[PDB]
PDB file of C-alpha atoms and ligand atoms in Angstrom:
ATOM      1  CA  UNK T   1      21.049  25.505  12.476  1.00 28.78           C
ATOM      2  CA  UNK T   2      19.058  25.162   8.978  1.00 30.98           C
ATOM      3  CA  UNK T   3      15.487  25.531   8.235  1.00 30.84           C
ATOM      4  CA  UNK T   4      12.535  27.473   6.820  1.00 31.92           C
ATOM      5  CA  UNK T   5      13.040  30.094   7.694  1.00 33.06           C
ATOM      6  CA  UNK T   6      14.933  34.017   6.333  1.00 30.76           C
ATOM      7  CA  UNK T   7      17.742  33.852   8.080  1.00 30.59           C
ATOM      8  CA  UNK T   8      18.113  29.971   7.570  1.00 33.01           C
ATOM      9  CA  UNK T   9      15.871  28.681   4.295  1.00 36.09           C
ATOM     10  CA  UNK T  10      17.371  27.257   1.390  1.00 36.55           C
ATOM     11  CA  UNK T  11      19.009  30.713   0.080  1.00 36.13           C
ATOM     12  CA  UNK T  12      21.762  30.219   3.403  1.00 37.39           C
ATOM     13  CA  UNK T  13      22.540  26.435   2.880  1.00 39.00           C
ATOM     14  CA  UNK T  14      24.839  26.601   0.669  1.00 38.48           C
ATOM     15  CA  UNK T  15      27.361  28.323   3.636  1.00 35.45           C
ATOM     16  CA  UNK T  16      27.070  25.380   5.149  1.00 37.11           C
ATOM     17  CA  UNK T  17      26.360  22.650   2.274  1.00 40.92           C
ATOM     18  CA  UNK T  18      29.423  24.100  -0.459  1.00 41.54           C
ATOM     19  CA  UNK T  19      27.014  21.122  -2.727  1.00 42.59           C
ATOM     20  CA  UNK T  20      23.859  23.100  -2.661  1.00 43.22           C
ATOM     21  CA  UNK T  21      26.007  24.751  -5.987  1.00 45.76           C
ATOM     22  CA  UNK T  22      26.987  21.304  -7.580  1.00 45.58           C
ATOM     23  CA  UNK T  23      25.384  20.127 -10.978  1.00 46.37           C
ATOM     24  CA  UNK T  24      23.230  17.352  -9.681  1.00 43.62           C
ATOM     25  CA  UNK T  25      20.913  19.107  -7.281  1.00 40.08           C
ATOM     26  CA  UNK T  26      16.436  18.311  -7.009  1.00 39.08           C
ATOM     27  CA  UNK T  27      14.199  19.549  -6.252  1.00 38.90           C
ATOM     28  CA  UNK T  28      14.106  20.774 -10.165  1.00 37.87           C
ATOM     29  CA  UNK T  29      10.748  21.994 -12.683  1.00 38.43           C
ATOM     30  CA  UNK T  30       9.265  18.952 -15.066  1.00 38.00           C
ATOM     31  CA  UNK T  31       9.659  20.993 -18.084  1.00 35.09           C
ATOM     32  CA  UNK T  32       7.275  18.116 -19.691  1.00 36.91           C
ATOM     33  CA  UNK T  33       7.573  19.055 -23.741  1.00 36.09           C
ATOM     34  CA  UNK T  34      11.494  18.683 -22.998  1.00 36.10           C
ATOM     35  CA  UNK T  35      10.834  15.606 -21.160  1.00 36.97           C
ATOM     36  CA  UNK T  36      11.595  13.083 -23.607  1.00 37.17           C
ATOM     37  CA  UNK T  37       9.985   9.616 -23.849  1.00 36.30           C
ATOM     38  CA  UNK T  38      12.375   6.903 -23.987  1.00 35.93           C
ATOM     39  CA  UNK T  39      11.355   3.620 -23.805  1.00 34.97           C
ATOM     40  CA  UNK T  40      14.462   1.752 -22.690  1.00 34.04           C
ATOM     41  CA  UNK T  41      12.942   2.279 -19.461  1.00 32.54           C
ATOM     42  CA  UNK T  42      10.762  -0.383 -17.591  1.00 31.49           C
ATOM     43  CA  UNK T  43       8.014  -0.230 -15.825  1.00 30.45           C
ATOM     44  CA  UNK T  44       8.066   0.693 -12.299  1.00 30.80           C
ATOM     45  CA  UNK T  45       7.895  -1.850  -9.596  1.00 32.72           C
ATOM     46  CA  UNK T  46       6.337  -0.993  -6.389  1.00 36.43           C
ATOM     47  CA  UNK T  47       6.294  -3.801  -4.423  1.00 35.89           C
ATOM     48  CA  UNK T  48       5.085  -3.070  -0.863  1.00 34.38           C
ATOM     49  CA  UNK T  49       2.424  -5.495   0.254  1.00 37.26           C
ATOM     50  CA  UNK T  50       5.250  -7.084   3.432  1.00 35.10           C
ATOM     51  CA  UNK T  51       6.377  -2.294   3.998  1.00 34.41           C
ATOM     52  CA  UNK T  52       6.623  -3.036   8.141  1.00 33.26           C
ATOM     53  CA  UNK T  53       6.087   0.678   9.378  1.00 33.23           C
ATOM     54  CA  UNK T  54       7.081   1.149  12.418  1.00 30.90           C
ATOM     55  CA  UNK T  55       7.274   4.445  14.245  1.00 28.23           C
ATOM     56  CA  UNK T  56       6.377   8.461  13.118  1.00 29.00           C
ATOM     57  CA  UNK T  57       8.455  11.188  13.799  1.00 29.71           C
ATOM     58  CA  UNK T  58       8.731  15.421  13.806  1.00 30.90           C
ATOM     59  CA  UNK T  59      11.938  16.148  12.533  1.00 27.37           C
ATOM     60  CA  UNK T  60      11.486  19.923  12.821  1.00 24.68           C
ATOM     61  CA  UNK T  61      11.493  19.501   9.015  1.00 20.65           C
ATOM     62  CA  UNK T  62       8.800  17.040   8.252  1.00 21.94           C
ATOM     63  CA  UNK T  63       7.127  14.224   9.514  1.00 21.55           C
ATOM     64  CA  UNK T  64       8.926  10.994   8.582  1.00 22.52           C
ATOM     65  CA  UNK T  65       7.002   8.105   8.673  1.00 19.86           C
ATOM     66  CA  UNK T  66       9.735   4.616   9.072  1.00 19.88           C
ATOM     67  CA  UNK T  67       9.547   1.810   8.374  1.00 21.30           C
ATOM     68  CA  UNK T  68      11.681  -2.431   9.393  1.00 21.05           C
ATOM     69  CA  UNK T  69      14.507  -2.189   6.611  1.00 23.44           C
ATOM     70  CA  UNK T  70      16.154  -5.171   8.389  1.00 23.17           C
ATOM     71  CA  UNK T  71      15.002  -7.738   5.714  1.00 24.11           C
ATOM     72  CA  UNK T  72      13.938  -7.807   2.334  1.00 20.23           C
ATOM     73  CA  UNK T  73      10.663  -5.624   2.192  1.00 18.44           C
ATOM     74  CA  UNK T  74       8.650  -2.714   0.838  1.00 22.48           C
ATOM     75  CA  UNK T  75      10.839  -2.126  -2.708  1.00 25.31           C
ATOM     76  CA  UNK T  76      11.419  -0.209  -5.795  1.00 25.09           C
ATOM     77  CA  UNK T  77      12.621  -2.053  -9.013  1.00 20.98           C
ATOM     78  CA  UNK T  78      12.598  -1.563 -12.806  1.00 23.09           C
ATOM     79  CA  UNK T  79      12.313   1.124 -13.889  1.00 28.55           C
ATOM     80  CA  UNK T  80      14.892   3.683 -14.366  1.00 30.56           C
ATOM     81  CA  UNK T  81      17.069   1.891 -11.634  1.00 30.60           C
ATOM     82  CA  UNK T  82      19.384  -1.039 -11.615  1.00 32.26           C
ATOM     83  CA  UNK T  83      19.471  -4.206  -8.783  1.00 34.48           C
ATOM     84  CA  UNK T  84      16.568  -3.147  -5.695  1.00 36.11           C
ATOM     85  CA  UNK T  85      16.427   0.026  -3.921  1.00 33.28           C
ATOM     86  CA  UNK T  86      14.446  -0.983   0.292  1.00 31.94           C
ATOM     87  CA  UNK T  87      12.383   1.560   1.463  1.00 33.98           C
ATOM     88  CA  UNK T  88      13.966   3.407   4.730  1.00 32.61           C
ATOM     89  CA  UNK T  89      10.529   6.747   5.330  1.00 31.51           C
ATOM     90  CA  UNK T  90       8.354   8.699   3.868  1.00 29.43           C
ATOM     91  CA  UNK T  91       8.009  11.698   4.580  1.00 31.98           C
ATOM     92  CA  UNK T  92       6.552  15.694   2.759  1.00 31.28           C
ATOM     93  CA  UNK T  93       6.776  18.491   1.688  1.00 27.26           C
ATOM     94  CA  UNK T  94       3.839  20.860   2.186  1.00 26.28           C
ATOM     95  CA  UNK T  95       2.758  24.733   1.872  1.00 25.13           C
ATOM     96  CA  UNK T  96       1.448  27.540   3.631  1.00 25.85           C
ATOM     97  CA  UNK T  97      -2.282  27.081   1.272  1.00 29.52           C
ATOM     98  CA  UNK T  98      -3.100  24.739  -1.763  1.00 29.07           C
ATOM     99  CA  UNK T  99      -0.844  27.030  -4.645  1.00 30.55           C
ATOM    100  CA  UNK T 100       1.959  26.331  -3.235  1.00 30.57           C
ATOM    101  CA  UNK T 101       4.249  23.186  -1.063  1.00 26.57           C
ATOM    102  CA  UNK T 102       5.538  20.596  -4.254  1.00 26.93           C
ATOM    103  CA  UNK T 103       9.543  20.240  -5.017  1.00 27.08           C
ATOM    104  CA  UNK T 104       9.408  19.982  -8.402  1.00 26.82           C
ATOM    105  CA  UNK T 105       7.568  21.304  -9.690  1.00 23.61           C
ATOM    106  CA  UNK T 106       6.208  20.374 -14.133  1.00 23.07           C
ATOM    107  CA  UNK T 107       6.136  23.857 -16.856  1.00 22.62           C
ATOM    108  CA  UNK T 108       6.373  25.330 -13.375  1.00 22.44           C
ATOM    109  CA  UNK T 109       3.040  23.994 -12.021  1.00 21.17           C
ATOM    110  CA  UNK T 110       3.768  24.253  -8.610  1.00 21.20           C
ATOM    111  CA  UNK T 111       1.461  21.751  -6.051  1.00 20.30           C
ATOM    112  CA  UNK T 112      -0.194  22.047  -2.743  1.00 20.35           C
ATOM    113  CA  UNK T 113       2.337  19.192  -1.040  1.00 22.87           C
ATOM    114  CA  UNK T 114       4.933  15.954  -2.413  1.00 24.60           C
ATOM    115  CA  UNK T 115       4.953  13.192  -0.916  1.00 23.72           C
ATOM    116  CA  UNK T 116       8.184  10.862  -0.994  1.00 22.72           C
ATOM    117  CA  UNK T 117       9.229   7.694  -0.851  1.00 18.77           C
ATOM    118  CA  UNK T 118      12.881   6.737   0.319  1.00 19.78           C
ATOM    119  CA  UNK T 119      14.815   3.360  -0.889  1.00 18.16           C
ATOM    120  CA  UNK T 120      18.309   3.187  -0.241  1.00 16.53           C
ATOM    121  CA  UNK T 121      19.831   0.450  -3.280  1.00 14.73           C
ATOM    122  CA  UNK T 122      20.610  -2.535  -0.785  1.00 14.83           C
ATOM    123  CA  UNK T 123      23.694  -3.222  -2.626  1.00 14.12           C
ATOM    124  CA  UNK T 124      26.059  -0.712  -0.907  1.00 13.00           C
ATOM    125  CA  UNK T 125      24.393  -2.581   3.313  1.00 17.37           C
ATOM    126  CA  UNK T 126      22.995   0.465   4.581  1.00 16.71           C
ATOM    127  CA  UNK T 127      21.051   4.411   4.604  1.00 18.76           C
ATOM    128  CA  UNK T 128      24.351   5.467   5.534  1.00 16.92           C
ATOM    129  CA  UNK T 129      27.043   3.932   2.718  1.00 15.43           C
ATOM    130  CA  UNK T 130      24.042   4.545   0.962  1.00 14.95           C
ATOM    131  CA  UNK T 131      23.556   8.575   0.345  1.00 14.87           C
ATOM    132  CA  UNK T 132      27.695   8.782  -0.471  1.00 17.21           C
ATOM    133  CA  UNK T 133      27.264   6.864  -3.562  1.00 20.20           C
ATOM    134  CA  UNK T 134      25.936   8.715  -7.224  1.00 21.51           C
ATOM    135  CA  UNK T 135      23.441   4.957  -7.431  1.00 21.08           C
ATOM    136  CA  UNK T 136      23.050   5.257  -3.970  1.00 18.64           C
ATOM    137  CA  UNK T 137      18.847   6.564  -3.063  1.00 21.00           C
ATOM    138  CA  UNK T 138      15.914   6.197  -5.455  1.00 19.67           C
ATOM    139  CA  UNK T 139      13.197   8.544  -4.248  1.00 17.02           C
ATOM    140  CA  UNK T 140       9.531   8.845  -5.643  1.00 15.56           C
ATOM    141  CA  UNK T 141       7.721  11.428  -5.693  1.00 14.58           C
ATOM    142  CA  UNK T 142       4.105  11.460  -5.801  1.00 16.16           C
ATOM    143  CA  UNK T 143       2.376  15.080  -6.002  1.00 17.21           C
ATOM    144  CA  UNK T 144      -0.673  16.178  -4.055  1.00 17.37           C
ATOM    145  CA  UNK T 145      -3.481  18.086  -4.872  1.00 14.57           C
ATOM    146  CA  UNK T 146      -6.186  19.603  -2.910  1.00 15.61           C
ATOM    147  CA  UNK T 147     -10.341  17.316  -4.117  1.00 12.28           C
ATOM    148  CA  UNK T 148     -11.115  14.293  -2.827  1.00 10.43           C
ATOM    149  CA  UNK T 149      -9.420  13.278   0.737  1.00  9.88           C
ATOM    150  CA  UNK T 150      -6.966  10.621   0.571  1.00  8.82           C
ATOM    151  CA  UNK T 151      -8.886   7.450   2.193  1.00  7.92           C
ATOM    152  CA  UNK T 152      -5.293   5.857   2.820  1.00  6.68           C
ATOM    153  CA  UNK T 153      -3.646   9.650   4.069  1.00  6.19           C
ATOM    154  CA  UNK T 154      -6.527   9.355   7.205  1.00  5.81           C
ATOM    155  CA  UNK T 155      -4.656   7.381   9.772  1.00  3.58           C
ATOM    156  CA  UNK T 156      -1.292   9.760   9.242  1.00  4.55           C
ATOM    157  CA  UNK T 157      -3.490  12.304   9.213  1.00  4.47           C
ATOM    158  CA  UNK T 158      -4.705  11.605  12.525  1.00  4.90           C
ATOM    159  CA  UNK T 159      -1.204  10.972  13.996  1.00  4.89           C
ATOM    160  CA  UNK T 160      -0.421  14.241  13.029  1.00  8.87           C
ATOM    161  CA  UNK T 161      -1.968  15.777  16.281  1.00 10.65           C
ATOM    162  CA  UNK T 162       0.235  13.311  19.118  1.00 11.68           C
ATOM    163  CA  UNK T 163       3.848  14.751  17.173  1.00 13.96           C
ATOM    164  CA  UNK T 164       2.905  18.019  16.900  1.00 14.51           C
ATOM    165  CA  UNK T 165       6.728  19.465  17.845  1.00 13.70           C
ATOM    166  CA  UNK T 166       9.859  18.596  16.980  1.00 13.42           C
ATOM    167  CA  UNK T 167      11.330  15.060  18.684  1.00 13.80           C
ATOM    168  CA  UNK T 168       7.964  13.813  19.457  1.00 12.18           C
ATOM    169  CA  UNK T 169       7.309   9.966  18.372  1.00 11.64           C
ATOM    170  CA  UNK T 170       4.881   7.528  17.857  1.00 13.26           C
ATOM    171  CA  UNK T 171       4.510   4.207  17.601  1.00 14.90           C
ATOM    172  CA  UNK T 172       2.984   3.743  14.070  1.00 12.92           C
ATOM    173  CA  UNK T 173       2.896  -0.086  13.243  1.00 14.84           C
ATOM    174  CA  UNK T 174       0.861  -0.899   9.849  1.00 17.56           C
ATOM    175  CA  UNK T 175       0.736   1.493   8.204  1.00 12.50           C
ATOM    176  CA  UNK T 176      -0.476   0.423   4.103  1.00 15.12           C
ATOM    177  CA  UNK T 177       2.472   2.407   2.025  1.00 16.01           C
ATOM    178  CA  UNK T 178       0.369   1.549  -0.820  1.00 16.47           C
ATOM    179  CA  UNK T 179      -2.815   3.643  -0.413  1.00 16.30           C
ATOM    180  CA  UNK T 180      -0.638   6.368  -0.910  1.00 19.37           C
ATOM    181  CA  UNK T 181      -0.513   5.930  -4.986  1.00 18.60           C
ATOM    182  CA  UNK T 182      -2.103   6.674  -8.056  1.00 20.78           C
ATOM    183  CA  UNK T 183      -4.164   5.040 -10.315  1.00 20.71           C
ATOM    184  CA  UNK T 184      -1.354   5.022 -12.809  1.00 21.95           C
ATOM    185  CA  UNK T 185       3.108   4.672 -12.735  1.00 22.33           C
ATOM    186  CA  UNK T 186       3.984   7.180 -15.617  1.00 20.75           C
ATOM    187  CA  UNK T 187       6.583   8.303 -14.560  1.00 19.41           C
ATOM    188  CA  UNK T 188      10.162  11.135 -14.989  1.00 19.76           C
ATOM    189  CA  UNK T 189      13.255  10.354 -13.539  1.00 17.73           C
ATOM    190  CA  UNK T 190      16.696  11.894 -13.803  1.00 19.63           C
ATOM    191  CA  UNK T 191      19.749  11.506 -11.449  1.00 17.82           C
ATOM    192  CA  UNK T 192      19.888  13.771  -8.560  1.00 20.25           C
ATOM    193  CA  UNK T 193      19.418  15.355  -4.665  1.00 20.91           C
ATOM    194  CA  UNK T 194      18.604  15.002  -1.053  1.00 21.64           C
ATOM    195  CA  UNK T 195      16.448  18.026  -1.599  1.00 17.38           C
ATOM    196  CA  UNK T 196      17.412  19.016   2.400  1.00 16.90           C
ATOM    197  CA  UNK T 197      20.673  18.913   3.866  1.00 14.74           C
ATOM    198  CA  UNK T 198      23.027  17.683   2.849  1.00 12.16           C
ATOM    199  CA  UNK T 199      21.693  17.537  -0.244  1.00 11.78           C
ATOM    200  CA  UNK T 200      24.299  14.489  -0.930  1.00  7.56           C
ATOM    201  CA  UNK T 201      24.494  13.748  -4.969  1.00  8.68           C
ATOM    202  CA  UNK T 202      23.076  10.435  -4.701  1.00  6.81           C
ATOM    203  CA  UNK T 203      19.828  10.248  -5.486  1.00  3.76           C
ATOM    204  CA  UNK T 204      17.996   8.843  -8.362  1.00  3.88           C
ATOM    205  CA  UNK T 205      14.294  10.520  -8.726  1.00  6.21           C
ATOM    206  CA  UNK T 206      11.097   8.858 -10.662  1.00  7.71           C
ATOM    207  CA  UNK T 207       8.023  11.294  -9.933  1.00  7.02           C
ATOM    208  CA  UNK T 208       4.787  10.424 -11.055  1.00  4.98           C
ATOM    209  CA  UNK T 209       3.190  11.908 -13.880  1.00  3.44           C
ATOM    210  CA  UNK T 210      -0.416  11.509 -12.062  1.00  5.84           C
ATOM    211  CA  UNK T 211      -0.923  13.663  -9.273  1.00  7.23           C
ATOM    212  CA  UNK T 212      -3.152  12.272  -6.294  1.00  7.41           C
ATOM    213  CA  UNK T 213      -5.700  14.265  -4.673  1.00  7.55           C
ATOM    214  CA  UNK T 214      -6.226  14.883  -0.257  1.00 10.01           C
ATOM    215  CA  UNK T 215      -9.260  16.973   0.692  1.00 13.02           C
ATOM    216  CA  UNK T 216      -8.283  20.788   2.213  1.00 16.57           C
ATOM    217  CA  UNK T 217      -9.442  19.037   5.503  1.00 15.80           C
ATOM    218  CA  UNK T 218      -6.008  16.599   5.503  1.00 15.86           C
ATOM    219  CA  UNK T 219      -3.632  19.334   4.037  1.00 18.32           C
ATOM    220  CA  UNK T 220      -4.494  21.307   7.106  1.00 18.81           C
ATOM    221  CA  UNK T 221      -3.739  18.910   9.755  1.00 16.81           C
ATOM    222  CA  UNK T 222      -0.264  19.168   8.623  1.00 16.74           C
ATOM    223  CA  UNK T 223       0.293  22.386   8.426  1.00 17.61           C
ATOM    224  CA  UNK T 224      -0.767  21.942  12.190  1.00 16.61           C
ATOM    225  CA  UNK T 225       2.418  21.012  12.442  1.00 12.83           C
ATOM    226  CA  UNK T 226       5.279  22.763  14.550  1.00 12.34           C
ATOM    227  CA  UNK T 227       8.685  23.502  13.254  1.00 10.30           C
ATOM    228  CA  UNK T 228      10.282  24.359  16.967  1.00 10.60           C
ATOM    229  CA  UNK T 229       9.538  22.395  19.909  1.00 11.50           C
ATOM    230  CA  UNK T 230       6.924  21.360  22.350  1.00 10.79           C
ATOM    231  CA  UNK T 231       7.673  24.905  25.176  1.00 10.23           C
ATOM    232  CA  UNK T 232       9.079  27.250  22.534  1.00  8.96           C
ATOM    233  CA  UNK T 233       7.697  30.198  19.860  1.00  7.70           C
ATOM    234  CA  UNK T 234       4.503  27.828  18.431  1.00  7.40           C
ATOM    235  CA  UNK T 235       6.238  28.359  13.914  1.00  9.80           C
ATOM    236  CA  UNK T 236       3.731  26.903  11.903  1.00  7.71           C
ATOM    237  CA  UNK T 237       5.749  23.935  10.208  1.00 10.78           C
ATOM    238  CA  UNK T 238       4.187  25.690   6.548  1.00  9.09           C
ATOM    239  CA  UNK T 239       6.153  25.548   3.226  1.00  4.85           C
ATOM    240  CA  UNK T 240       8.992  23.679   4.163  1.00  4.40           C
ATOM    241  CA  UNK T 241       9.609  23.472   0.071  1.00  3.79           C
ATOM    242  CA  UNK T 242      13.224  24.361  -1.536  1.00  3.46           C
ATOM    243  CA  UNK T 243      12.321  25.407  -4.418  1.00  2.40           C
ATOM    244  CA  UNK T 244      13.826  23.902  -7.690  1.00  5.60           C
ATOM    245  CA  UNK T 245      17.234  24.654  -9.162  1.00  6.67           C
ATOM    246  CA  UNK T 246      19.230  24.316 -12.280  1.00  4.34           C
ATOM    247  CA  UNK T 247      18.761  21.591 -14.490  1.00 10.10           C
ATOM    248  CA  UNK T 248      22.236  22.197 -15.995  1.00 12.49           C
ATOM    249  CA  UNK T 249      23.561  19.353 -17.820  1.00 11.16           C
ATOM    250  CA  UNK T 250      21.475  16.830 -17.228  1.00 10.30           C
ATOM    251  CA  UNK T 251      18.402  15.280 -18.763  1.00 10.97           C
ATOM    252  CA  UNK T 252      14.755  14.404 -17.481  1.00  9.37           C
ATOM    253  CA  UNK T 253      13.001  11.881 -19.061  1.00 10.31           C
ATOM    254  CA  UNK T 254      10.301  10.182 -19.118  1.00 11.48           C
ATOM    255  CA  UNK T 255       8.290   6.104 -18.948  1.00 10.77           C
ATOM    256  CA  UNK T 256       5.412   7.402 -21.226  1.00 10.49           C
ATOM    257  CA  UNK T 257       4.478   8.791 -24.861  1.00  8.30           C
TER     258      UNK T 257
HETATM  259  N1  LIG Z 301      23.737  27.908  18.294  1.00 10.18           N
HETATM  260  C1  LIG Z 301      22.779  28.757  17.531  1.00 10.18           C
HETATM  261  N2  LIG Z 301      22.822  27.451  16.215  1.00 10.18           N
HETATM  262  N3  LIG Z 301      22.182  28.292  15.369  1.00 10.18           N
HETATM  263  C2  LIG Z 301      21.804  29.616  15.680  1.00 10.18           C
HETATM  264  S1  LIG Z 301      20.551  31.158  15.013  1.00 10.18           S
HETATM  265  C3  LIG Z 301      21.561  31.493  14.455  1.00 10.18           C
HETATM  266  C4  LIG Z 301      22.593  30.205  12.958  1.00 10.18           C
HETATM  267  O1  LIG Z 301      23.614  29.644  13.274  1.00 10.18           O
HETATM  268  N4  LIG Z 301      21.777  30.894  11.811  1.00 10.18           N
HETATM  269  C5  LIG Z 301      22.311  30.533  10.851  1.00 10.18           C
HETATM  270  C6  LIG Z 301      23.290  28.379  10.791  1.00 10.18           C
HETATM  271  C7  LIG Z 301      23.225  27.624   9.357  1.00 10.18           C
HETATM  272  C8  LIG Z 301      22.011  27.930   8.989  1.00 10.18           C
HETATM  273  S2  LIG Z 301      22.418  27.272   7.522  1.00 10.18           S
HETATM  274  N5  LIG Z 301      24.123  28.130   6.061  1.00 10.18           N
HETATM  275  O2  LIG Z 301      20.881  27.346   6.442  1.00 10.18           O
HETATM  276  O3  LIG Z 301      22.570  25.875   7.681  1.00 10.18           O
HETATM  277  C9  LIG Z 301      22.125  29.523   8.656  1.00 10.18           C
HETATM  278  C10 LIG Z 301      20.985  30.169   9.156  1.00 10.18           C
HETATM  279  S3  LIG Z 301      22.432  29.949  18.224  1.00 10.18           S
HETATM  280  N1  LIG Z 302      24.282   8.222   7.781  1.00 12.14           N
HETATM  281  C1  LIG Z 302      23.644   9.281   7.920  1.00 12.14           C
HETATM  282  N2  LIG Z 302      21.622   9.534   8.205  1.00 12.14           N
HETATM  283  N3  LIG Z 302      21.657  10.141   6.819  1.00 12.14           N
HETATM  284  C2  LIG Z 302      21.604  10.800   6.837  1.00 12.14           C
HETATM  285  S1  LIG Z 302      21.323  12.563   6.644  1.00 12.14           S
HETATM  286  C3  LIG Z 302      19.904  11.496   6.320  1.00 12.14           C
HETATM  287  C4  LIG Z 302      18.656  12.380   5.140  1.00 12.14           C
HETATM  288  O1  LIG Z 302      19.531  13.872   5.252  1.00 12.14           O
HETATM  289  N4  LIG Z 302      17.879  12.152   4.589  1.00 12.14           N
HETATM  290  C5  LIG Z 302      17.005  12.436   3.736  1.00 12.14           C
HETATM  291  C6  LIG Z 302      17.137  14.347   3.042  1.00 12.14           C
HETATM  292  C7  LIG Z 302      16.544  14.144   1.893  1.00 12.14           C
HETATM  293  C8  LIG Z 302      15.563  13.124   1.414  1.00 12.14           C
HETATM  294  S2  LIG Z 302      14.286  14.218   0.510  1.00 12.14           S
HETATM  295  N5  LIG Z 302      14.021  15.661   0.739  1.00 12.14           N
HETATM  296  O2  LIG Z 302      13.620  13.311  -0.277  1.00 12.14           O
HETATM  297  O3  LIG Z 302      14.971  14.625  -0.636  1.00 12.14           O
HETATM  298  C9  LIG Z 302      15.575  11.814   1.558  1.00 12.14           C
HETATM  299  C10 LIG Z 302      15.831  11.868   2.779  1.00 12.14           C
HETATM  300  S3  LIG Z 302      23.759  10.770   6.442  1.00 12.14           S
HETATM  301 ZN1  LIG Z 303      11.531  15.405   0.787  1.00 11.80          ZN
END
């Protein structure tokens, strides 16, 4: 099955998922000088006051913090989006070292990690139908750099010891994802894809310009997770990022001057 190793990593994915070589794949490098300011773009509306986290899961590729998406709560609107997108999960991608880990890059700069808050378009009724549509998902991407600790991340960090291996989950209620946001909601946006198989071309990407700072100790704890299941050979969960893909016929738009 697919993964991040030499024999099953991103360069192999196209054999089982030929859309890997498609026209709107993610991530991409964001060339800041060629991204054009679009004054028609709206401020992003992130309304996470209500949300309701349920669980955290090690799925063998990353860990997902999952939300109850059965009601109109935790929604992303505005920005480049038409209509309302509901939060279902967030997860991260990160490196073996602080100098790599992000999926998107900024003028070729790689951040230590990248947070993806995943939302589905409520006009398609649920996530499984939404991923079959070109405007089905909106993923809010946030870069992580290593410096000061992010206090709002620590509850996530501390539960990781309980989901070390693939297939482990833990109750994870009352986690407020507002604690993971930077101050500014300035963003870049472009049409793309899921960055893991099945690589579906269903995502409006919204990537925040301002990174959050996390501590070295916080990211070191991400790197203690395992790709493998319990009682299998230990493979540290590191470098679970897809490299930048060809931009092809797309424009990246900036919300800010
Ligand atoms: N039952 C088994 N499933 N997988 C194995 S290891 C060999 C294997 O399946 N390799 C492999 C499978 C899929 C992909 S891919 N194209 O990256 O999804 C890459 C590599 S033994
Ligand atoms: N009916 C279906 N249920 N689930 C699926 S695919 C699930 C999935 O692959 N989700 C997912 C994958 C990648 C990303 S990402 N890294 O944010 O582009 C977000 C979300 S199709
Ligand atoms: Zn992701």
